[PDB]
Amino acid sequence: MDFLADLMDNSELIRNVTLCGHLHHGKTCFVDCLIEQTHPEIRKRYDQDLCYTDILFTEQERGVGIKSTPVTVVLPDTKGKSYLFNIMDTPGHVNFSDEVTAGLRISDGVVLFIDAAEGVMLNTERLIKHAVQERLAVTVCINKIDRLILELKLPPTDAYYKLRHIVDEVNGLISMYSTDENLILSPLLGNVCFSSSQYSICFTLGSFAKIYADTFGDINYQEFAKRLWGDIYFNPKTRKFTKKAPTSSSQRSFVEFILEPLYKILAQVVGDVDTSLPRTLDELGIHLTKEELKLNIRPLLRLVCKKFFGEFTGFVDMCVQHIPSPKVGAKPKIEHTYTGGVDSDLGEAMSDCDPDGPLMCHTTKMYSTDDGVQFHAFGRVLSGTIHAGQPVKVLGENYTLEDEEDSQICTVGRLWISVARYHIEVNRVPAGNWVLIEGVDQPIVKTATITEPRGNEEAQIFRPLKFNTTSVIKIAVEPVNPSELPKMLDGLRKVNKSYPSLTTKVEESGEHVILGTGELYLDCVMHDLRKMYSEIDIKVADPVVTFCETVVETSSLKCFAETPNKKNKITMIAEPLEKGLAEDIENEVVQITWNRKKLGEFFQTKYDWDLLAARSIWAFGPDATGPNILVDDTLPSEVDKALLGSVKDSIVQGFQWGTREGPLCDELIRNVKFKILDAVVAQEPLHRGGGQIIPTARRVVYSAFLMATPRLMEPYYFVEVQAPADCVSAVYTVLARRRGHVTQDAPIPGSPLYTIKAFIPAIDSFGFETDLRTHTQGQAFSLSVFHHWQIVPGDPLDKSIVIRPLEPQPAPHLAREFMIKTRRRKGLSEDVSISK
Amino acid sequence: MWIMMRREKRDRRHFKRMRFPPFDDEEPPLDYADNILDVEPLEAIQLELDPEEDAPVLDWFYDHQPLRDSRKYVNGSTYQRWQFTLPMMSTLYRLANQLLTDLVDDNYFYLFDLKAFFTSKALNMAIPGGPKFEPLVRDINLQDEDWNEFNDINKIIIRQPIRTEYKIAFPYLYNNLPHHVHLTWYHTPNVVFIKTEDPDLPAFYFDPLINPISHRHSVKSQEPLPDDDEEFELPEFVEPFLKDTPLYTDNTANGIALLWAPRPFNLRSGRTRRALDIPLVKNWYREHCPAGQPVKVRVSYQKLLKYYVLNALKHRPPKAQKKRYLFRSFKATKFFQSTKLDWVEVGLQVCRQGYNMLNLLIHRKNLNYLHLDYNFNLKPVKTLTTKERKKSRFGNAFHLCREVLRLTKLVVDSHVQYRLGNVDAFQLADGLQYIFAHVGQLTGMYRYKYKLMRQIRMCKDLKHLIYYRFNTGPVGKGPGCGFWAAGWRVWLFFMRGITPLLERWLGNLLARQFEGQRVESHFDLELRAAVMHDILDMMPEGIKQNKARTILQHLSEAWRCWKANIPWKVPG
Amino acid sequence: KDKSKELHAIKERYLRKFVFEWDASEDTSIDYNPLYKERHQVQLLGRGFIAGIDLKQQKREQSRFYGDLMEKRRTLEEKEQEEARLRKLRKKEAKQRWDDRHWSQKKLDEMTDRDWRIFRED
RNA sequence: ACUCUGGUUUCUCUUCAGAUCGCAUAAAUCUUUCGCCUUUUACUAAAGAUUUCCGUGGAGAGGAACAACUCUGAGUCUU
Ligand SMILES: O=P(O)(O)O[C@H]1[C@@H](OP(=O)(O)O)[C@@H](OP(=O)(O)O)[C@@H](OP(=O)(O)O)[C@@H](OP(=O)(O)O)[C@H]1OP(=O)(O)O
């Protein structure tokens, strides 16, 4: 037990991994198998999956993992070397992408999981991109190999064909996301593992070569581990592996020396269990008693495969030599994560992960207790050492060097490293490891840079947790009895803490609004809000979708705005951006930190913008990645550049906030270009203050937007469904009912299931996940995630459109129906006026 | 039995439903010694088994207790914890394909799980295929929630209506006040299983139901690979682990297809269940819906599911006991003996015993104007004068006992008709199903305990379920169904329910000694009695005890004075 | 008529006698929309059939979609055994169709004791 | 490949029962809430709390049958 702490002290025998993968792909069962390997007293039930890491009750009843769970375990390697493994088995549901990112910032390794009978799915398509964008080594473990044999009953050659088709599709798809050309995955190289979690089967080519070497002996398992995967074969007469076929009915090496023995052993334990089973266990050295042979087929298969393969050494040596150690992976993690990068003193102090250096651990999760009162933070100690009772300094997400007010000095109460259900109390946690810090819940929402007090003077914070999806769905929350409203404020704060992309908000009409990704996500968060944190009654409005406001054409007149003093006068024009330019802003392709020359060349080549304005672009919409843009287009002779540069900041401040709110209603402004045609600034810095410019800035922005023909943009969810070919029409009929349209219907190779990829309006996608399965009697299944935004049909600003109370309106009325009710939901005026 | 009873209903153009009662009246049940013992029984309903396939079960399939003697398969005569080989189990599974839906996963039960039904009950909402329930809490005022600024219509966008199944799938998002609600989203990865149909085929075959992989080599996506005779050599000893053993045996396809069999047929071994506790058509009304069936069987499906969900919800763990068996104490007693006997003899014996009991109960007060016939019908020997009519009346318990005796007498007489060659085995089964599906019509027991209507309706619902599944294709409509075990068990659960009630009422009735607006009467008399008891108790035992009425009058006067709000102060 | 029914449902949401036969008012399968009025019956890969219903009745009643899919994918080299097994089935249940025959076209010599009882019962 | 190893079945008695005792499912009583409401006996149909009933698992004890054919782990596991 103390060897756990001894290995904990070292920083090179430690791996930080995430077993990220699609929904229901065996990740939780894989961790359960690892636990069953380590802990002997923990034995899985004969039929019910134990689901060890599924510790909260809601995922124990719904059957889907919801929140990532830390697992700290010592795993022997193929050669028997112990390694300390930090496992963050992220939930697989695409609506739960919050926890994938939350566990991916604090990990250096990505262990993908792909169902052998399902192939690459929607989820994985985004996790490979995300992990590459976060600069982690990516490794694939095709799980549920049993499906190719006990369910599909494929010939072993076709099983290998399926395996290579799903292996190279990962390589082919990842080549778009990965700039480097060292990221080619192949089991012969050691990137790819093969496993069946239910039957505990797990191997890399090296491990299986180790089994053969163990049996026959005098075998070098490395050379034989190579020359297994591929189109090469084996010659029984010359005992050499050849590219060409040694016989007419030849067979690939992998199939011949790995897949075929698996087929035979599991067929012997599911067929002729009574006649030819002892014969095939004598030939394999697996000795069993009478009472362990009287079990059912599934437990017998799991036991026999545990005896044959043994411990999960294949996963261990797959992980060890193909993901960097924290001492090695710290440099890319820091240069992508720390705001100042490696260049700063603290940045250079991170490249080596010194256990005695400065402590600026990073926490990215909130694992509540069983009473829900206090929140135990979870984070990685990127460097330094932490102790129980140590007086520590917790930073925030708005904390900077200039803004020293966003921090708190706290006392680390206790420290313990956690493995799912049970936690191990430790007085000291060294660098490069994980920990649940206690007593730091008060000054944190979501991420935090918990660092030393009065010891890290110039230390900055870590970058905000950037996600892959966007919080789209929006639900109103109120107490049943307003006499217990404060009881619900703290519950909303708690759920905001325990959900990385949850966005609580109070609006002008005294409305509490919760933002989420999908139906199941909001179901889980409100179940937590009701039965866990607030233990009161809560009324919910039916889900509504956040909208966006855009333009399609230039304004008829150059509408302007002046300060109340009638001295400053700013004239601006709102026009749409080039198709695809908005995406090239949100993807961090271009930034405001760029120098002028690079952005000028970018807009001169890719978007053919004139250099007279390409070097006169101030801001990029709201926040930093906002899709809108502010453009300076005043001729220098009429607007003094020296005089302009004073309000150059305030105009942006009134613009970065001007586009955030939106004149039509309190919704984001997207895909709009603002050209300034005239500036009349006060010649003295006295009357041109921010309190006068900023209202004028927002007013001129709103006036230009309104005078330009405005439109609403609704977010479309990208829905994939997997159904047998008899139910493809049953998906077309459902998707046609909700204004959707199908993009592709591709059968999955090596499986009768299909994959129908379509788009569906988010406001029109409520219940579709149930409207499909019930219509197809549960055979079909859908997953949804936000893809893009589209102009809502119709003109949002027509007064001839009448909104009936309780029946859907046609497409042309939608743009009018959506905002007005939204306006009514916002508490604003019924219509829009040019004064706004 | 299901696969053949559908054939004789298709073979016999007309069918003769056995008479009911199958026996005449005023005639005692036939003696077992003279008639039943000698007559050779007719052939029973049995399927000829194909020795080419059904051989593993050919030797013993239609025995009384199959494999009772075989120590290899069963533990012994206690007949528990059977062990069955895979060929045996596969043969049984193939033979039971008519009573087994071919569902591999449970994704077909998306919103027809019992957890979803618990949710629907706790929400006072009904799945279209699901049952209706009374509200858990009336909350009529909570139903009449006022038009607030929260639930205001003009603030709500309606695109697609929030259907009940939406509020059931996500009972914490689409609705309010979700008390005693359960969750289920068990979208198990839909198992992609393709059961073989070819008797001759490789077990691991690439059947066309699988979309081809379509392997390609267009782009030179090469990987580290060796050349011929490149720094490697294999030992002569080393080989693939299993070379001698074939890739697939004959029992491989059956074994793999046995993985995804229903619950009973995925066990290599397991404990033994009773004949009562095996619901054969349980997985029939649990199905999603009947495919375009009339209303009188759709409502039957909802009414079966309603009772199923009610039993599932109201289930409680059994209470810890001390295991006092009843017949074992009888065997201990000197008054009883054990003997192997034919069942029909036992029925003819018990009918006479119950008839004698009821005649004794009738002639308990020596009233000769009530007579019980041999069909358990209580009739007057002469037109009843009103005094004698009222003088000879029995409570609901006696009538219930008489009617259940009539039911068992009907069953026994039907079996006797079978043994006497009066009816066929098919006729016997159809008659038994009619008895167990029309107990109300044949016996007026519901007039003596109203709750029986449930069972009555239950059985009728079961009929509808089996019939619509029985009268399918070329079978047609007629009295040719003998699948009685579906409704036969229900009256046995009714029997275990009513056994102690009758065993207590008869005990009270048939014994040497017979035994047979209350809160305002509670605290007046008891309190005053306690006060007087204490006062007289501590009052000295002399002649002064003549003053008890004085104390009672003082108590009454004080109570009156408090009631009259008048000062009460006795000086002495 | 679906539109009026669904709008009406929206308005609904947001605003002694020993009888044995049940009532038709307890029926719940009534639906105002097609996607639940007419649910896509599970073809179950065509090789799986509902328990109670007869097998070949389902086979001929089946949508045949997987039948034509197999006709498309199956190659000639592995159609011979399909045709052979199909014809062998047709022959072996033709055995039952002819050997087990109604007495209306069974002669006296063909007619057996079971068929004799069938005729006498008729 | 040497050893000691050593029964399962069956019928009872006595307790403990966590667990789907039971991959099944009845009845009664009581307290609330409805429905009916004309009084008991039947009910109504949900809730809660009880009890009996048909069964069950485990442990132990006592007999009987295969009690003596075996058999299992242990071992130094002896060319
Ligand atoms: O009169 P219907 O409602 O159309 O149904 C009848 C009725 O049975 P149910 O009324 O109970 O459904 C018949 O006689 P009873 O049952 O009323 O005495 C008989 O049913 P039995 O076979 O049980 O006598 C018959 O069935 P079949 O056509 O199979 O003879 C059929 O019932 P189904 O409508 O369920 O077929």
XYZ file of N, CA, C and O in Angstrom, chain A residues 575-683:
436
model
N -22.707 45.357 -42.673
C -22.822 44.545 -43.874
C -22.414 43.121 -43.537
O -21.655 42.907 -42.584
N -22.902 42.131 -44.281
C -22.531 40.744 -43.992
C -21.086 40.457 -44.365
O -20.468 41.151 -45.174
N -20.551 39.406 -43.752
C -19.195 38.958 -44.020
C -19.180 37.932 -45.150
O -20.217 37.428 -45.586
N -17.977 37.627 -45.626
C -17.813 36.610 -46.655
C -18.214 35.242 -46.116
O -17.992 34.929 -44.943
N -18.823 34.431 -46.980
C -19.252 33.090 -46.600
C -18.063 32.244 -46.160
O -17.159 31.970 -46.956
N -18.056 31.829 -44.895
C -16.969 31.061 -44.331
C -15.964 31.871 -43.541
O -15.126 31.280 -42.850
N -16.019 33.202 -43.629
C -15.116 34.035 -42.841
C -15.399 33.899 -41.350
O -14.470 33.894 -40.535
N -16.676 33.785 -40.977
C -17.031 33.664 -39.567
C -16.421 32.412 -38.949
O -15.940 32.445 -37.810
N -16.437 31.298 -39.683
C -15.823 30.074 -39.177
C -14.318 30.241 -39.008
O -13.724 29.677 -38.083
N -13.686 31.018 -39.885
C -12.248 31.254 -39.787
C -11.875 32.213 -38.663
O -10.693 32.558 -38.543
N -12.830 32.655 -37.850
C -12.557 33.442 -36.654
C -12.742 32.607 -35.393
O -11.907 32.634 -34.489
N -13.844 31.856 -35.319
C -14.124 31.033 -34.150
C -13.155 29.867 -34.010
O -13.018 29.322 -32.910
N -12.482 29.473 -35.088
C -11.517 28.384 -35.049
C -10.117 28.850 -34.674
O -9.162 28.084 -34.834
N -9.978 30.084 -34.190
C -8.695 30.665 -33.797
C -7.699 30.709 -34.950
O -6.485 30.738 -34.722
N -8.193 30.706 -36.190
C -7.303 30.783 -37.345
C -6.555 32.109 -37.351
O -5.344 32.155 -37.598
N -7.259 33.204 -37.078
C -6.656 34.525 -36.956
C -7.051 35.108 -35.610
O -8.151 34.849 -35.110
N -6.153 35.890 -35.019
C -6.352 36.445 -33.691
C -6.094 37.944 -33.718
O -5.661 38.508 -34.727
N -6.370 38.590 -32.584
C -6.000 39.990 -32.417
C -4.548 40.128 -31.980
O -3.976 41.223 -32.077
N -3.930 39.043 -31.510
C -2.516 39.061 -31.159
C -1.610 38.985 -32.380
O -0.389 39.091 -32.230
N -2.174 38.796 -33.570
C -1.379 38.808 -34.788
C -0.806 40.195 -35.049
O -1.390 41.216 -34.675
N 0.355 40.224 -35.696
C 0.890 41.475 -36.202
C 0.097 41.918 -37.431
O -0.651 41.146 -38.036
N 0.268 43.189 -37.795
C -0.529 43.757 -38.876
C -0.204 43.112 -40.219
O -1.102 42.887 -41.036
N 1.074 42.817 -40.471
C 1.471 42.295 -41.776
C 0.834 40.937 -42.052
O 0.338 40.684 -43.158
N 0.849 40.043 -41.060
C 0.313 38.703 -41.275
C -1.188 38.735 -41.531
O -1.679 38.062 -42.443
N -1.933 39.514 -40.743
C -3.372 39.625 -40.969
C -3.669 40.295 -42.305
O -4.624 39.919 -42.998
N -2.868 41.296 -42.675
C -3.046 41.934 -43.967
C -2.858 40.969 -45.121
O -3.658 40.944 -46.056
N -1.801 40.155 -45.067
C -1.597 39.143 -46.100
C -2.707 38.098 -46.080
O -3.155 37.640 -47.139
N -3.159 37.710 -44.884
C -4.254 36.754 -44.761
C -5.496 37.251 -45.491
O -6.082 36.532 -46.309
N -5.902 38.490 -45.214
C -7.097 39.038 -45.844
C -6.868 39.449 -47.292
O -7.839 39.572 -48.045
N -5.617 39.670 -47.700
C -5.328 39.972 -49.096
C -5.381 38.722 -49.962
O -5.793 38.786 -51.126
N -4.966 37.580 -49.416
C -4.913 36.346 -50.193
C -6.200 35.533 -50.059
O -6.872 35.255 -51.057
N -6.554 35.148 -48.832
C -7.697 34.263 -48.637
C -9.030 34.977 -48.815
O -10.003 34.357 -49.258
N -9.104 36.268 -48.478
C -10.366 36.999 -48.530
C -10.259 38.282 -49.347
O -11.131 39.147 -49.232
N -9.188 38.424 -50.135
C -8.940 39.521 -51.073
C -9.383 40.891 -50.561
O -9.901 41.710 -51.327
N -9.152 41.160 -49.280
C -9.474 42.461 -48.712
C -8.375 43.464 -49.037
O -7.186 43.135 -49.011
N -8.783 44.691 -49.350
C -7.828 45.729 -49.710
C -6.950 46.090 -48.518
O -7.419 46.169 -47.380
N -5.660 46.307 -48.790
C -4.714 46.635 -47.730
C -5.018 47.974 -47.072
O -4.560 48.215 -45.949
N -5.775 48.848 -47.739
C -6.152 50.118 -47.125
C -7.011 49.894 -45.887
O -7.065 50.749 -44.995
N -7.692 48.751 -45.818
C -8.459 48.382 -44.637
C -7.890 47.161 -43.928
O -8.156 46.969 -42.736
N -7.111 46.334 -44.635
C -6.573 45.119 -44.031
C -5.629 45.428 -42.878
O -5.434 44.587 -41.994
N -5.031 46.619 -42.869
C -4.223 47.081 -41.750
C -4.989 48.045 -40.854
O -4.379 48.748 -40.042
N -6.312 48.091 -40.990
C -7.175 48.977 -40.217
C -8.363 48.204 -39.660
O -9.515 48.635 -39.739
N -8.090 47.038 -39.088
C -9.112 46.179 -38.500
C -8.813 46.092 -37.009
O -7.792 45.526 -36.600
N -9.703 46.649 -36.190
C -9.444 46.755 -34.760
C -9.804 45.486 -33.996
O -8.931 44.852 -33.397
N -11.078 45.099 -34.017
C -11.544 44.044 -33.131
C -12.287 42.956 -33.902
O -12.733 43.145 -35.036
N -12.423 41.793 -33.253
C -13.116 40.635 -33.817
C -14.333 40.318 -32.942
O -14.274 39.459 -32.060
N -15.440 41.010 -33.207
C -16.704 40.729 -32.565
C -16.653 40.748 -31.050
O -15.727 41.291 -30.439
N -17.667 40.162 -30.415
C -17.653 40.052 -28.955
C -16.552 39.113 -28.486
O -16.174 38.168 -29.182
N -16.041 39.387 -27.292
C -14.955 38.606 -26.674
C -13.761 38.640 -27.633
O -13.515 39.673 -28.276
N -13.006 37.552 -27.756
C -11.850 37.491 -28.641
C -12.090 36.665 -29.892
O -11.588 37.016 -30.962
N -12.847 35.576 -29.789
C -13.129 34.702 -30.919
C -14.456 35.021 -31.599
O -14.930 34.216 -32.407
N -15.066 36.162 -31.282
C -16.339 36.541 -31.847
C -16.327 36.605 -33.360
O -15.379 37.096 -33.980
N -17.393 36.105 -33.985
C -17.416 36.049 -35.455
C -17.620 37.402 -36.112
O -17.319 37.550 -37.304
N -18.123 38.394 -35.383
C -18.250 39.729 -35.943
C -16.872 40.377 -36.071
O -15.851 39.826 -35.657
N -16.852 41.572 -36.658
C -15.603 42.279 -36.904
C -15.878 43.775 -36.897
O -16.940 44.235 -37.324
N -14.919 44.533 -36.374
C -14.945 45.988 -36.422
C -13.883 46.447 -37.411
O -12.724 46.031 -37.318
N -14.277 47.301 -38.349
C -13.390 47.761 -39.407
C -13.309 49.279 -39.366
O -14.336 49.965 -39.310
N -12.087 49.799 -39.389
C -11.840 51.227 -39.516
C -11.695 51.552 -40.997
O -10.796 51.031 -41.665
N -12.581 52.410 -41.509
C -12.609 52.720 -42.934
C -12.741 54.219 -43.185
O -13.195 54.626 -44.259
N -12.358 55.047 -42.219
C -12.390 56.490 -42.403
C -11.121 56.953 -43.104
O -10.017 56.518 -42.760
N -11.279 57.828 -44.093
C -10.122 58.410 -44.754
C -9.347 59.285 -43.770
O -9.949 60.023 -42.983
N -8.014 59.206 -43.772
C -7.229 59.925 -42.753
C -7.408 61.433 -42.779
O -7.295 62.074 -41.726
N -7.666 62.024 -43.947
C -7.769 63.479 -44.027
C -8.946 64.011 -43.220
O -8.864 65.107 -42.654
N -10.042 63.257 -43.150
C -11.225 63.705 -42.424
C -11.207 63.305 -40.955
O -11.809 63.998 -40.127
N -10.534 62.211 -40.611
C -10.450 61.735 -39.234
C -8.980 61.651 -38.855
O -8.231 60.846 -39.423
N -8.570 62.473 -37.891
C -7.181 62.486 -37.450
C -6.850 61.174 -36.750
O -7.526 60.787 -35.790
N -5.809 60.491 -37.231
C -5.438 59.202 -36.654
C -5.017 59.353 -35.198
O -5.358 58.513 -34.356
N -4.269 60.413 -34.883
C -3.887 60.658 -33.496
C -5.112 60.866 -32.617
O -5.199 60.311 -31.515
N -6.074 61.661 -33.089
C -7.319 61.832 -32.350
C -8.141 60.550 -32.339
O -8.848 60.276 -31.363
N -8.064 59.759 -33.413
C -8.835 58.523 -33.488
C -8.349 57.497 -32.472
O -9.160 56.790 -31.863
N -7.034 57.409 -32.271
C -6.454 56.382 -31.424
C -6.854 56.458 -29.966
O -6.650 55.481 -29.237
N -7.411 57.584 -29.523
C -7.885 57.684 -28.149
C -9.185 56.914 -27.956
O -9.309 56.111 -27.025
N -10.167 57.146 -28.834
C -11.420 56.395 -28.786
C -11.324 55.061 -29.502
O -12.318 54.325 -29.549
N -10.166 54.737 -30.083
C -9.982 53.427 -30.699
C -10.261 52.298 -29.715
O -10.708 51.219 -30.119
N -10.012 52.527 -28.426
C -10.313 51.520 -27.415
C -11.782 51.562 -27.007
O -12.440 50.519 -26.924
N -12.310 52.761 -26.745
C -13.670 52.880 -26.226
C -14.707 52.426 -27.248
O -15.725 51.828 -26.879
N -14.479 52.712 -28.532
C -15.404 52.262 -29.569
C -15.475 50.742 -29.589
O -16.560 50.156 -29.684
N -14.321 50.080 -29.493
C -14.298 48.621 -29.425
C -15.012 48.137 -28.169
O -15.783 47.170 -28.209
N -14.778 48.810 -27.040
C -15.437 48.423 -25.797
C -16.952 48.525 -25.921
O -17.683 47.653 -25.436
N -17.443 49.581 -26.567
C -18.861 49.673 -26.853
C -19.335 48.790 -27.984
O -20.545 48.629 -28.165
N -18.406 48.216 -28.747
C -18.731 47.300 -29.831
C -18.664 45.845 -29.382
O -19.566 45.058 -29.683
N -17.597 45.472 -28.670
C -17.494 44.112 -28.150
C -18.639 43.797 -27.200
O -19.025 42.632 -27.053
N -19.189 44.819 -26.549
C -20.408 44.677 -25.768
C -21.653 45.000 -26.581
O -22.741 44.508 -26.261
N -21.513 45.807 -27.635
C -22.659 46.117 -28.474
C -23.174 44.912 -29.237
O -24.385 44.696 -29.329
N -22.267 44.109 -29.790
C -22.673 42.916 -30.522
C -23.099 41.782 -29.603
O -23.803 40.870 -30.051
N -22.686 41.811 -28.336
C -23.059 40.748 -27.411
C -24.550 40.779 -27.098
O -25.192 39.726 -27.004
N -25.121 41.974 -26.935
C -26.506 42.082 -26.487
C -27.489 41.910 -27.640
O -28.385 41.064 -27.582
N -27.339 42.706 -28.694
C -28.231 42.635 -29.826
C -29.450 43.522 -29.675
O -30.127 43.524 -28.642
N -29.749 44.302 -30.717
C -30.879 45.241 -30.622
C -32.236 44.567 -30.673
O -33.133 44.946 -29.909
N -32.420 43.589 -31.564
C -33.716 42.929 -31.685
C -34.134 42.303 -30.362
O -35.265 42.487 -29.901
N -33.222 41.568 -29.738
C -33.442 40.968 -28.432
C -32.080 40.583 -27.875
O -31.060 40.676 -28.561
N -32.071 40.141 -26.619
C -30.803 39.895 -25.944
C -30.157 38.613 -26.458
O -30.042 37.627 -25.722
N -29.730 38.623 -27.719
C -29.074 37.486 -28.346
C -27.812 37.947 -29.061
O -27.672 39.115 -29.433
N -26.894 37.001 -29.251
C -25.618 37.290 -29.891
C -25.821 37.809 -31.310
O -26.746 37.408 -32.019
N -24.949 38.727 -31.713
C -24.881 39.204 -33.088
C -23.753 38.457 -33.783
O -22.619 38.435 -33.289
N -24.057 37.838 -34.918
C -23.108 36.963 -35.587
C -23.054 37.281 -37.074
O -24.073 37.628 -37.680
N -21.856 37.169 -37.650
C -21.635 37.313 -39.090
C -22.056 38.704 -39.573
O -22.926 38.863 -40.430
N -21.423 39.720 -38.990
C -21.680 41.114 -39.339
C -20.350 41.851 -39.439
O -19.452 41.646 -38.616
N -20.227 42.707 -40.451
C -19.059 43.557 -40.639
C -19.460 45.012 -40.449
O -20.413 45.484 -41.076
N -18.728 45.720 -39.592
C -19.025 47.107 -39.248
C -17.962 48.013 -39.857
O -16.790 47.954 -39.469
N -18.374 48.853 -40.803
C -17.498 49.834 -41.429
C -17.799 51.216 -40.868
O -18.950 51.662 -40.898
N -16.770 51.894 -40.372
C -16.905 53.267 -39.894
C -16.617 54.206 -41.058
O -15.547 54.139 -41.670
N -17.572 55.085 -41.364
C -17.437 56.006 -42.483
C -17.155 57.442 -42.069
O -16.805 58.256 -42.930
N -17.291 57.777 -40.787
C -17.075 59.146 -40.336
C -16.918 59.147 -38.824
O -17.730 58.546 -38.114
N -15.882 59.829 -38.342
C -15.640 59.985 -36.916
C -15.378 61.452 -36.614
O -14.520 62.077 -37.247
N -16.113 61.994 -35.654
C -15.934 63.365 -35.189
C -15.745 63.270 -33.680
O -16.710 63.258 -32.910
N -14.491 63.188 -33.252
C -14.144 63.017 -31.848
C -13.837 64.379 -31.248
O -13.388 65.302 -31.940
N -14.091 64.513 -29.949
C -13.753 65.742 -29.246
C -12.246 65.958 -29.264
O -11.471 65.038 -28.986
N -11.832 67.182 -29.591
C -10.414 67.511 -29.666
C -9.730 67.488 -28.306
O -8.497 67.541 -28.253
